[PDB]
Design a binder for these strands. Sequence first.
DNA 1: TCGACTAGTTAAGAAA
DNA 2: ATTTCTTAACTAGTCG
Lengths: 100, 99
Amino acid sequence: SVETIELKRGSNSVYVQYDDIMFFESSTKSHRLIAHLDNRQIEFYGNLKELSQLDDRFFRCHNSFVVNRHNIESIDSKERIVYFKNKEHCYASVRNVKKI
Amino acid sequence: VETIELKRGSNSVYVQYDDIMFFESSTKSHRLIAHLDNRQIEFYGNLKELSQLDDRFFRCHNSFVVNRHNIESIDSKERIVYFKNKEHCYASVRNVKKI
DNA sequence: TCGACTAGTTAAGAAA
DNA sequence: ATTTCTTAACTAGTCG
């Protein structure tokens, strides 16, 4: 039926719907990502490559970011800033921005 | 999911089909105004192309393409189309009956 | 409910 | 990116 992702943190896992997530970014903690949800961030163990491979909507817009295409509100290609439905934003690399 | 890209110079804003009530031509040549639930967006496009996108986008009038999904009611005598967000547009005599 | 005569207006291609 | 020129095609109103 539904499409969800398991975010693992040690003995925890938190379960979240694909489109509950705006984007992922790499954490300052090695081997952890930050899922940016509608109204809170979640830190968890994962890799951006694997996440981008999950679904066509998850696109590697930047070495440090995988964005959920479904939650992109707008794109400024000059500045290469991607804005999301929840008012957050991230940055896109020069090479990848046009292909979002 | 079905969404549309509204292009403003280097900007593009991305909006879901049914977030949009209708489009109207702007006073600025070659621009349209997308009427959303709680905001209007000006952008470059043509009504013909938009009406071709989907069966729900119907050219009810030379200056308007309406999203059938968001039509609340229709007064055919006055030829006024009302939308779920409490605004309206007009339909041309020829096209009103075919909405 | 329909055409049909009029007169004023505009969408969108080209092109700049 | 935004505009100028262009005109076929549109529009509302009227009248029957």
